[PDB]
Design a protein around this ligand. Structure first.
Ligand code: DME
Ligand code: DME
Ligand code: NAG
Ligand code: NAG
Ligand code: NAG
Ligand code: NAG
Lengths: 532, 532
C-alpha cells in the first residue's frame, strides 16, 4: 500500500488527499517525541517510544498550547494564524506530503513555522504542503515545537528547565527526518529547512548550533534571522523573566526546584494568562520566552560565532518583505487602527519610536527620529506612519538579516537574497499596512493556484515562479534552472551585493538592500548607545 | 564747491569720479581714528584729532597690515581679494560715494568687509560703491578695521590689549558716520550696515552689542552670522593664542605687560609670519585672531543674548551662497586642487571631515559622515567632493545663519532671507567650486553693469534687481517696491520660513532652507558631543 509506510519508530498509515485535480499522499500527525507532559514540562524532549501496530496518520494533530490572538474576533486576516485544532501539551508531531507515485530519493523541504516563539501551528491552511509537493515533486515536511514558557522558559543551571527546549523539539524532528524520510521516498542528505520570522531565525539558529548542523543540507530564511534583537535573550534575562512568571503565579521563589515545581502544577492557560507581564519594557516586536544564549546550544555569543565562521557552511536563500513593521504597530503603537488609514501625529510618532527601540537613551531616540523624519514636512501623517513602519521593519527584520547575510557570505558557499514587495490583491488587512509580515508564505506554498481563493492570474504566475526557485534551490543549491532564460537570480557577493525583487512586474536586479538605513542600525546606533 | 565738505573733524576735499557715462562725488581716505601705532598697537581706537585746513580725500588710503594670499601668484581669482594699496598700521580711514548733485537727507549704507578677521580692504575693485550710490541714489560708505593680531589679540584683564579693538574700529567709523554723514547729504537715522562673511558676522555683532546698537537703523548680513563657530573665541582661548604668539616670537611670557611690550617692538610682518601657528587644531575655516566673548562688548554668551532677546530689534535682510565651503577645501583639504575637478577618494573624504569639525570625537565624525554619505555609491568622487563642500558650508555658514535667523525673528521687526545660487559666467575659478563664497558681492555692488567686465545681460538684470532690493530695504525696511508686480520677496516667519532664490531664472519661493541638515548641525550633533 502507498499509504502504508514502515518507519524505525513503527508503521504509519497516511491518507490520499486531492490537489489541483490530482492526488498525493499525506501522513499527518506523526509523533517524533514523547508527549512532554507532567514532570516533563519545560524539560528536553525525549525520542518517541517505538510503537507496534499501525499509527493512524490521516488527520492533523493537536497544536501546542499558546496565546490566541482575539484582537479581531471573526476576522480572517488574524484568525488564519490562530490554532485550528485543539491545543494540548501533547503537540510534538510532524506532517509529510508525499508525491504519487511515491518517489525513490527526492528533495526534502522541512517547514518551521513562526509566531514570535509564543505561537504557531503546523496545521494552518496556509502551511498545507500538498501544492508544493505536487507542483515541484518534493517531500514536504512540517514540524511542530513548543512555544511560550513551555518551549522557552530558561533557568540556566537547572536540568528541569534549561532553556531552548522548543529548539531541541525542532532538532528532534529533524533527527527523525534524517533517520526515517527515506521510507517516504525522501532523500535525507538533500534536506532543506525553511521558515518565516521566528521560523527563519530558528533556521539560522540550527545553522549556528553544532548539534543541529549535520541534520540538514541547506536553508531558507524568510523575514527572520538568528541575530534578530527579539529572537534571543541572555541567561540572566531569561532567568529574570522565569522568576517574574512565578511571581505572577504566586510561586515559591527561593530556589529553582521550588519555582519549577510550582510552574508545573499550573494549568497551561494560567501560564499563558500572565505570559506578557514579564517583558522588561513597554515595547513592540518583543516576546517573553525566546531562545537563550546558554553556552550549550549556542557555544558563544551569536556575533562572535558569525565573526569567526563558527557555523554550517552551505548555500542559503533568504529575504524580507517591504513592510515588516506594520503588524506590530497596529497591535501596539498608539494612533494605528485597522479601519482607518492611521495617519500619525508627531506625538504618536515619538511614542512609536520609543516603543520600537526600548533600550535607547534619549540621544538614541533622537538619532532614530532624525534618520526617519522629513523635516520639510514633519506633520505629514502619511510620512510619519510610513516612517514608523520602516523603523520597526528595519530594526527588527531587514537590518539584522543584512548583517547576517554579510557575515554568512564571507564563509558560506552561496547566498541568494530576495526582496518581496507584492501586496496580495485579496488581502483583507488595510492598505496602509502595505506588503505585510507573513504574506509571502501563501505564495511560497502555492495557494494562488487555487481559484476559489481569488488570486489574480499574475499572482499564480508569481507563486509558481517562487515555488520553483525555492524547490530548485532545495535540490541544487541554486534557484536558477541550469538551462533557461527568464532572468537569472544572481548570487549575492560581499562586493556587488545583488538581490532580486519578487513581484508580478518583470523581474529587475538591484544592489545594497537598504544600505543607508542598515548602516545606521548596524554600525552607528550601537556605537552611539555604547559610548553614552 | 560740491567736492568740499565741512565736517566736525574738519574740512575734506573729494574728487569727481565717472560712473556709467555719468559722474558722482567721492571722498576717499577720510580718517576716523588716531593712527593706532607705536604704544597704541592692540589698544582701543581713539577719535581722530580735528584738523585745520583741507584734508585731501581724492585717493584711496593704505590698507591694514595683513596676511597676503600668495597661493596662486598672478591669478586674478585670488589676487582681487588681496590689498591693492600699501599696507600700514596707519589704516583707519573710510570712503564715501555721494550722488551728484549732493542730496539733502538720503539713505546711507555702510559696508564692512570680510576676510576671516585676518584680512580685508575697503579699497578693492569689487567694493567700489560708485555704481550702487549712482544707481540707487544712496550715500555709500566703506569703513576699515584692524585685522589679525593687530585688531584681535585678546588678553582679557589688560587695558593695553583687551580684545575686540577691530570691532571698536568699526564702531568708531559708525560713530563718525552718525555724527558727520549729514554734511555729505546722508540721513544719519537711516543708516544700514552691511557686510560679507566676517563682515556679516560683524554686522550681527553690532546688533548684539549694546555700545553699537544706536549707531545704525538696520542691517544686512551676507554669508556670515555672529554665532558662526569661527567668528569668536572664549577669553581663555584668546589668552592662550596671544601667549602662543609671543612664544613664537621669543617673547618674555611671565606677565601681560612683558608680553605686550615685546609684541609691540616687533615689526608688523613678524607678527603675520607666525599668525597661523597658534590654531589649536589641524582645521579649515578657522582663523587665529577673532572677536572674544569678553563680558564688555558682548555682555554674555552669544546664545543667551539670542534666547533672551538681548539685541537690537529692527529689520534685517540676510542670506547665503550655494557653495560656501569650496574655498576652504581648495586651500586646506587634501585631494582638492585648482586645475583638476577634485574628485575625492573615501580617504580624503574622511580627512576632510576631521578638518571641518575639529572638536569632534570619533562618534561625532561618524555622525557627520553618515549624514553626508550616499552609501549606495560611496566611492563616487563627485559626491564625496560635493558632500564635503556641503559639510563645510553648512557647518560654518548656512546652519549658524539659520539659527541666528530663527532666534532673531522671534524678537525682530522684519526678516528677509535669500539663497544666492547663480555662478557668474566670467568666474576664473574651476567649475567644481560652484557658487563660491564671496561672489554675490560683485552683484551687490553693480559690477555687472560694466560691459568691459564681460558679464551677460541676464547678469546685469540680476545685479540691478539685487541692488534695488538692498537699497530699497535700506530705505524702508522692506526690499519690495510699495507698488510693483514682479514677485514679492516674502517676509520670513517662524511658522512658514519662506525665502527666495537669487539667480537669473524667474524668481521662485521656497521654505525651510536646508532644514534637514541644519537640524543635524544645530540640534543633534551638539547634543551628541555634549553627552559623550
Ligand atoms: C500584552 N498583551 C496581552 C496585551 C498583548 C499581546 C498580543 C499582541 C501581539 C503582539 C505581536 C503583534 C503581532 C500580532 N499578529 C501578527 C500576530 C497578529
Ligand atoms: C597656515 N598658512 C600659512 C599655511 C595657510 C594660511 C592661508 C590659507 C587661508 C585659509 C582660508 C582659505 C580661504 C582663502 N581664500 C578665500 C581667501 C582665498
Ligand atoms: C562552493 O563549493 C564548491 C566546492 O567545494 C566550490 O568549487 C565553489 O567555488 C563554491 N561556490 C561558492 C559560490 O562559494
Ligand atoms: C514692526 O513694528 C511696527 C511698529 O512698531 C508694527 O506695527 C509691525 O507689526 C512690525 N512688523 C513686523 C513684521 O514685525
Ligand atoms: C483514522 O483512520 C481510521 C482507520 O483506522 C478511520 O476509520 C478514521 O476515520 C480516522 N480518524 C478519524 C476520523 O479521526
Ligand atoms: C590730492 O589733491 C591734490 C590737490 O591738493 C592733488 O594735487 C593731488 O594730485 C592729490 N593727491 C595725489 C595725486 O596723491
Amino acid at each position: 500500500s502507498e499509504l502504508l509506510v514502515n518507519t524505525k519508530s513503527g508503521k504509519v498509515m497516511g491518507t490520499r488527499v486531492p490537489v489541483l485535480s490530482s492526488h498525493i499522499s499525506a501522513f499527518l500527525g506523526i509523533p517524533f517525541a514523547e508527549p512532554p507532559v507532567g514532570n516533563m514540562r519545560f524539560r528536553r524532549p525525549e525520542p518517541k517510544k517505538p510503537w507496534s501496530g499501525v499509527w493512524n496518520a490521516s488527520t492533523y494533530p493537536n497544536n501546542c498550547q499558546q496565546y490566541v490572538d482575539e484582537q479581531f474576533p471573526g476576522f480572517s486576516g488574524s484568525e488564519m494564524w490562530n490554532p485550528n485544532r485543539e491545543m494540548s501539551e501533547d503537540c510534538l508531531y510532524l506532517n509529510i506530503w508525499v508525491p504519487s507515485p511515491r518517489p525513490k530519493s527526492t528533495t526534502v523541504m522541512v517547514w518551521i513555522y513562526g509566531g514570535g516563539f509564543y505561537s504557531g501551528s503546523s496545521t494552518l491552511d496556509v502551511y498545507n504542503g500538498k501544492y508544493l509537493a505536487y507542483t515541484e515533486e518534493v517531500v514536504l515536511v512540517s514540524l511542530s515545537y513548543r512555544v511560550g514558557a513551555f518551549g522557552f522558559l530558561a533557568l540556566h543551571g537547572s536540568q528541569e528547565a534549561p532553556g531552548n527546549v522548543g529548539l531541541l523539539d525542532q532538532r528532534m524532528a529533524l533527527q527523525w527526518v534524517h533517520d526515517n524520510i527515506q521510507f517516504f521516498g525522501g532523500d535525507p542528505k538533500t534536506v532543506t529547512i525553511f521558515g518565516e520570522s521566528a521560523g527563519g531565525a530558528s533556521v539560522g539558529m540550527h545553522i549556528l548550533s553544532p548539534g543541529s548542523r549535520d541534520l540538514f543540507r541547506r536553508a531558507i530564511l524568510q523575514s527572520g534571522s538568528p541575530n534578530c534583537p527579539w529572537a534571543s535573550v541572555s541567561v540572566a534575562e531569561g532567568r529574570r523573566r522565569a522568576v517574574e512568571l512565578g511571581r505572577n503565579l504566586n510561586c515559591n521563589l527561593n530556589s529553582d526546584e521550588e519555582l519549577i515545581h510550582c510552574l508545573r502544577e499550573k494549568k497551561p492557560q494560567e501560564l499563558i494568562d500572565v505570559e506578557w507581564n514579564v517583558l522588561p519594557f513597554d515595547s513592540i516586536f518583543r516576546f517573553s520566552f525566546v531562545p537563550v544564549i546558554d553556552g550549550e546550544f549556542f557555544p558563544t555569543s551569536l556575533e562572535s560565532m558569525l565573526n569567526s565562521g563558527n557555523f554550517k557552511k552551505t548555500q542559503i536563500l533568504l529575504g524580507v518583505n517591504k513592510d515588516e513593521g506594520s503588524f506590530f504597530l497596529l497591535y501596539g503603537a498608539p494612533g494605528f487602527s485597522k479601519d482607518s488609514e492611521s495617519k500619525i501625529s508627531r506625538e504618536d510618532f515619538m511614542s512609536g519610536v520609543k516603543l520600537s527601540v526600548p533600550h535607547a537613551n534619549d540621544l538614541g531616540l533622537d538619532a532614530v527620529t532624525l534618520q526617519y523624519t522629513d523635516w520639510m514636512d514633519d506633520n505629514n501623517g502619511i510620512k510619519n506612519r510610513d516612517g514608523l513602519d520602516d523603523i520597526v521593519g528595519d530594526h527588527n527584520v531587514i537590518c539584522p538579516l543584512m548583517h547576517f547575510v554579510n557575515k554568512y557570505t564571507k564563509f558560506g558557499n552561496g547566498t541568494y537574497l530576495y526582496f518581496f514587495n507584492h501586496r496580495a490583491s485579496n488581502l483583507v488587512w488595510p492598505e496602509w499596512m502595505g506588503v505585510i509580515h507573513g504574506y509571502e508564505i501563501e505564495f511560497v506554498f502555492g495557494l494562488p493556484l487555487v481559484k476559489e481563493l481569488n488570486y489574480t492570474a499574475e499572482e499564480e504566475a508569481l507563486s509558481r515562479r517562487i515555488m520553483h526557485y525555492w524547490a530548485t534551490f532545495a535540490k541544487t543549491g541554486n534557484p536558477n534552472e541550469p538551462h533557461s532564460q527568464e532572468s537569472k537570480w544572481p548570487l549575492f557577493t560581499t562586493k556587488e551585493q545583488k538581490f532580486i525583487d519578487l513581484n508580478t512586474e518583470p523581474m529587475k536586479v538591484h544592489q545594497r538592500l537598504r544600505v543607508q538605513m542598515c548602516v545606521f542600525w548596524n554600525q552607528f546606533l550601537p556605537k552611539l548607545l555604547n559610548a553614552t
